[PDB]
Structures are given as C-alpha cells and as structure tokens.
Design an enzyme around this catalytic site. Structure first.
Site, PDB file in Angstrom:
ATOM      1  N   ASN A  10       0.888  -1.157   0.000  1.00 29.62           N
ATOM      2  CA  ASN A  10       0.000   0.000   0.000  1.00 29.62           C
ATOM      3  C   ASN A  10       0.933   1.215   0.000  1.00 29.62           C
ATOM      4  OD1 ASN A  10      -2.389   1.867   0.875  1.00 29.62           O
ATOM      5  ND2 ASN A  10      -3.326  -0.116   1.321  1.00 29.62           N
ATOM      6  N   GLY A  11       0.636   2.277  -0.770  1.00 29.51           N
ATOM      7  CA  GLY A  11      -0.418   2.411  -1.763  1.00 29.51           C
ATOM      8  C   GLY A  11       0.135   3.222  -2.935  1.00 29.51           C
ATOM      9  N   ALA A  12      -0.665   4.156  -3.469  1.00 38.08           N
ATOM     10  CA  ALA A  12      -0.309   4.984  -4.619  1.00 38.08           C
ATOM     11  C   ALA A  12      -0.376   4.148  -5.900  1.00 38.08           C
ATOM     12  CB  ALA A  12       1.019   5.706  -4.430  1.00 38.08           C
ATOM     13  N   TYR A  13       0.242   2.962  -5.868  1.00 34.75           N
ATOM     14  CA  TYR A  13       0.154   1.994  -6.949  1.00 34.75           C
ATOM     15  C   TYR A  13      -1.060   1.081  -6.730  1.00 34.75           C
ATOM     16  CZ  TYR A  13       2.873  -0.327  -3.302  1.00 34.75           C
ATOM     17  OH  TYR A  13       3.296  -0.863  -2.115  1.00 34.75           O
ATOM     18  N   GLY A  14      -1.404   0.805  -5.457  1.00 30.19           N
ATOM     19  CA  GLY A  14      -2.440  -0.163  -5.098  1.00 30.19           C
ATOM     20  C   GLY A  14      -2.052  -0.997  -3.874  1.00 30.19           C
ATOM     21  N   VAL A  15      -2.523  -2.259  -3.818  1.00 34.33           N
ATOM     22  CA  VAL A  15      -2.295  -3.231  -2.748  1.00 34.33           C
ATOM     23  C   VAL A  15      -1.474  -4.398  -3.301  1.00 34.33           C
ATOM     24  CG1 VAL A  15      -3.476  -4.851  -1.125  1.00 34.33           C
ATOM     25  CG2 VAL A  15      -4.501  -2.614  -1.641  1.00 34.33           C
ATOM     26  N   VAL A  16      -0.416  -4.824  -2.578  1.00 33.42           N
ATOM     27  CA  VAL A  16       0.389  -5.998  -2.915  1.00 33.42           C
ATOM     28  C   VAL A  16       0.258  -7.084  -1.845  1.00 33.42           C
ATOM     29  CG1 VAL A  16       2.644  -6.796  -3.773  1.00 33.42           C
ATOM     30  CG2 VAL A  16       2.052  -4.388  -3.910  1.00 33.42           C
ATOM     31  N   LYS A  31      -0.576  -7.687  -7.183  1.00 30.13           N
ATOM     32  CA  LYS A  31      -0.914  -6.273  -7.029  1.00 30.13           C
ATOM     33  C   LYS A  31      -2.328  -6.030  -7.553  1.00 30.13           C
ATOM     34  CE  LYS A  31       0.815  -3.258  -9.949  1.00 30.13           C
ATOM     35  NZ  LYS A  31       1.598  -2.352 -10.846  1.00 30.13           N
ATOM     36  N   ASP A 129      13.538   7.394 -12.613  1.00 27.99           N
ATOM     37  CA  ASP A 129      13.269   7.489 -11.189  1.00 27.99           C
ATOM     38  C   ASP A 129      14.004   6.417 -10.386  1.00 27.99           C
ATOM     39  OD1 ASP A 129      12.142   8.486  -8.721  1.00 27.99           O
ATOM     40  OD2 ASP A 129      10.278   7.336  -9.054  1.00 27.99           O
TER      41      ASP A 129
HETATM   42  C1  LIG Z   1       8.781  -5.082   1.031  1.00 25.25           C
HETATM   43  N1  LIG Z   1       8.095  -5.908   0.054  1.00 25.25           N
HETATM   44  C2  LIG Z   1       7.719  -5.587  -1.199  1.00 25.25           C
HETATM   45  C3  LIG Z   1       7.078  -6.698  -1.710  1.00 25.25           C
HETATM   46  N2  LIG Z   1       6.486  -6.799  -2.977  1.00 25.25           N
HETATM   47  C4  LIG Z   1       7.005  -7.424  -4.063  1.00 25.25           C
HETATM   48  O1  LIG Z   1       7.518  -8.539  -4.017  1.00 25.25           O
HETATM   49  C5  LIG Z   1       6.918  -6.670  -5.321  1.00 25.25           C
HETATM   50  C6  LIG Z   1       6.844  -5.336  -5.626  1.00 25.25           C
HETATM   51  C7  LIG Z   1       6.838  -5.207  -7.018  1.00 25.25           C
HETATM   52  C8  LIG Z   1       6.785  -3.926  -7.771  1.00 25.25           C
HETATM   53  O2  LIG Z   1       6.898  -3.873  -8.999  1.00 25.25           O
HETATM   54  C9  LIG Z   1       6.600  -2.667  -7.008  1.00 25.25           C
HETATM   55  C10 LIG Z   1       5.361  -2.438  -6.441  1.00 25.25           C
HETATM   56 CL1  LIG Z   1       4.079  -3.579  -6.666  1.00 25.25          CL
HETATM   57  C11 LIG Z   1       5.128  -1.314  -5.682  1.00 25.25           C
HETATM   58  C12 LIG Z   1       6.145  -0.411  -5.484  1.00 25.25           C
HETATM   59  C13 LIG Z   1       7.390  -0.639  -6.040  1.00 25.25           C
HETATM   60 CL2  LIG Z   1       8.671   0.479  -5.797  1.00 25.25          CL
HETATM   61  C14 LIG Z   1       7.617  -1.761  -6.798  1.00 25.25           C
HETATM   62  F1  LIG Z   1       8.840  -1.953  -7.324  1.00 25.25           F
HETATM   63  C15 LIG Z   1       6.890  -6.491  -7.513  1.00 25.25           C
HETATM   64  N3  LIG Z   1       6.937  -7.353  -6.503  1.00 25.25           N
HETATM   65  C16 LIG Z   1       7.102  -7.656  -0.693  1.00 25.25           C
HETATM   66  N4  LIG Z   1       7.711  -7.166   0.377  1.00 25.25           N
END
Ligand SMILES: Cn1cc(NC(=O)c2cc(C(=O)c3c(Cl)ccc(Cl)c3F)c[nH]2)cn1
Length: 340
Positions: A10-16, A31, A129
């Site tokens: 979370n967030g700005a991009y969504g939910v992971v 995501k 970026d």
């Molecule tokens: C700390 N932590 C992070 C994760 N998530 C992942 O594994 C994960 C993130 C991504 C991305 O492309 C990405 C996203 Cl979605 C949001 C922001 C940024 Cl900057 C990203 F680069 C792809 N896989 C799990 N734990």
C-alpha cells in the site's frame, strides 16, 4: 487458481500480497489496482507500465507472471490484478539496516543494476526514477528494477507539464543536474546520475545528496562536484537559477577519496565517471559493465540488449477513460494469447 498468503503493500500503486499458484505451489506477488479506470492519469500510467513490463524479458527487471482475466461482465470490471515476481526486500531497506553490506555486496548489486539498465537503455527507455527503494531484492540476492511509472522515451509530448518543468521529474535526491537546471539534454544519462547516487549511498550506507529543497540540493551537489563549468552555466534554462549559480565563488571539485575515505580505489574510479554535471561526460551503462570494478561478474557474453526499441507513441494519444480501459483489456488478452 491462487491462494493468498499475506498482505504486504500500500499504496499509490495499489495493494500488494504474497500468494501461491494452487497447482504449482510457486510463490508470487499479486498487485490489485483498485478502480483502475476511474482516473485518466492513473489509467494511462497502468497501460504504460503493462506495455513496458510485457516488452522486457530480463532477469534484472521485474516481470509480469500473470494478469487475472475478468470473470465478471465487462462493465463491472473495475480493478486489475497483476501477478509479479515475489521480492522479499529492496535496496533501501538493505542499505539502512543491520544487515550486512560489504564491498562485495555493493559490487554485485551495482553489477545487476547496470546489467538491467544496459538492456532497458538499449530499448530507448529512460527510467527517470531510480532510487534504492525501486530496486527490489529477493531471497536469492537477485536485484530487479521496478516502478516504470516515470519512464519515458528520448523525445516526448509537449502536452505534458514535465516536458518544461524538468525540476519536478522524479525524486530530488537522485535527480540529475540536467533535470534540476533544464539543460535541454535529456538522455539515458539521467539514469546514470541516479546510479551514481545509489552507488555512493551503498558505499557509505547513507544518502549522498539529501538536499532539503531545490536550492539546497544544488548546494549539496556543488559541495562535492564544485561549481558547474561556464559552458553548463550558459545552458541553464531559467534566468534566476542561472544568476544564482553565477553569484557564487568558483569551487574546485573534491576528489572522491575525500568524500568516501578509505573506500575502494576502483569503486571511486567508476563512481567519478558517473557523477559529472554534463550528461554526455558520464559513463554509459554498457561501458560501466566494462569497468575494472565489475571485472568479477562482467560477462559480455551474457549481458543482452533489447531489440526492438520500445515505442511511447501510444502514450501521446488523447484517449477517454473508456478507451484506456479497452486498451488495457487488450493488453490482458494479448498477454494470454501470446502464452496460450
Ligand atoms: C517489502 N516488500 C515488497 C514486496 N512486494 C514485491 O515482491 C513486489 C513489488 C513489485 C513492484 O513492482 C513494485 C510495487 Cl508492486 C510497488 C512499489 C514498487 Cl517500488 C515496486 F517496485 C513487484 N513485486 C514484498 N515485500
């Protein structure tokens, strides 16, 4: 088809969330981009990133593993679900922690970053970026570049504010001089400035130029690089900035040995090749992979280019939300067509 493990983002991009494909057991990141098509700006970014990630096939660039198909009527498809490589950490968390980071870590992380940029750069994509937190790292120490929201080609649309207001592009601490000063030379070298900032950060485990605002940013850079040359000062876009820099006494560059005392000679050699005022004076990604500091990992024979280049034309187009929705859905269909 997928079994949710836990939520992470979370967030700005969504939910992971972390997850596993039920059939294979293989772990992934999912995501959710909720209300994906409600805002034109967001929808445009989504389409841009979908096309970019589908375009690259590279170990050092985050990959789409799946996009879930709407199992609802089209009119009620509201949010998009993207399945990605699961990455445990990122370079920020690693640098700013009690985890190890020796010269060997620095060397290997830089190697992979540059490997990924050589590929991306060759496709004529400037990420614009790069910062530690955009560089994800998994349990195996693989580094992957993500977050292509900011990415652009070499010649962009004058209808975007950023075209003229370069000083607002990306993140202040890793923002190249040419952006800050509008030097009218916007190339892949933008990225190599950020790489230099990341490199420095990894060597000292703190940020190299953490300016509190615009003017202080320039000041912090100039404390090390010295004052820009006359030729660069002339090329400064806005009068007031131009005048400000001219109002300061000449300052000699500090050798990097002084900035980072006792740091590896070969590391500072390469660092210096990256952090220069003039875009075209900076080392390229491809050439940095040739530098002695990266001897240990460099394999010309396994550092691919990307053919053909990526085209940003679609982004220039004036589409309504409903057309952007279609275009995104086409990309989901194309993804699955190309596999199955
Ligand atoms: C700390 N932590 C992070 C994760 N998530 C992942 O594994 C994960 C993130 C991504 C991305 O492309 C990405 C996203 Cl979605 C949001 C922001 C940024 Cl900057 C990203 F680069 C792809 N896989 C799990 N734990």
């Amino acid at each position: 088809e997928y079994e949710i493990i836990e939520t992470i983002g979370n967030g700005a991009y969504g939910v992971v969330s972390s997850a596993r494909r039920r059939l294979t057991g293989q772990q992934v990141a999912i995501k959710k981009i909720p209300n994906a098509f409600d805002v034109v700006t967001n929808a445009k970014r989504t389409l841009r990133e979908l096309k970019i990630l589908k375009h690259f096939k590279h170990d050092n660039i985050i990959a789409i593993k799946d996009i879930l198909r709407p199992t609802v009527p089209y009119g009620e498809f509201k949010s998009v679900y993207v399945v990605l490589d699961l990455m445990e950490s990122d370079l920020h968390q690693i640098i700013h922690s009690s985890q190890p980071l020796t010269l060997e870590h620095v060397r290997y992380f830089l190697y992979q970053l540059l490997r990924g940029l050589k590929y991306m750069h060759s496709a004529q994509v400037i990420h614009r970026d790069l910062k530690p937190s955009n560089l994800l790292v998994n349990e195996n120490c693989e580094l992957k570049i993500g977050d292509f929201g900011m990415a652009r080609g070499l010649c962009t649309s004058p209808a975007e504010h950023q075209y003229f207001m370069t000083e607002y592009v990306a993140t202040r601490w890793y923002r190249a001089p040419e952006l800050m000063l509008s030097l009218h030379e916007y190339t892949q070298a933008i990225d190599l400035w950020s790489v230099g900032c990341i490199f420095g950060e990894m060597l000292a485990r703190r940020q190299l130029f953490p300016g509190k605002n615009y003017v202080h940013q320039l000041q912090l850079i100039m404390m090390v690089l010295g004052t820009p040359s006359p030729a660069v000062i002339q090329a400064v876009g806005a009068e007031r900035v131009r005048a400000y820099i001219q109002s300061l006494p000449p300052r000699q560059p500090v050798p990097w040995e002084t900035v980072y005392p006792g740091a590896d000679r070969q590391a500072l050699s390469l660092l210096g090749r990256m952090l220069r005022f003039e875009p075209s004076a900076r080392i390229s990604a491809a050439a940095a992979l040739r530098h002695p500091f990266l001897a240990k990992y460099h394999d010309p024979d396994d550092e691919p280019d990307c053919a053909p280049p990526f085209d940003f034309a679609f982004d220039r187009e004036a589409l309504t939300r409903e057309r952007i929705k279609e275009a995104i859905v086409a990309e989901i269909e194309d993804f699955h067509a190309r596999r199955e």
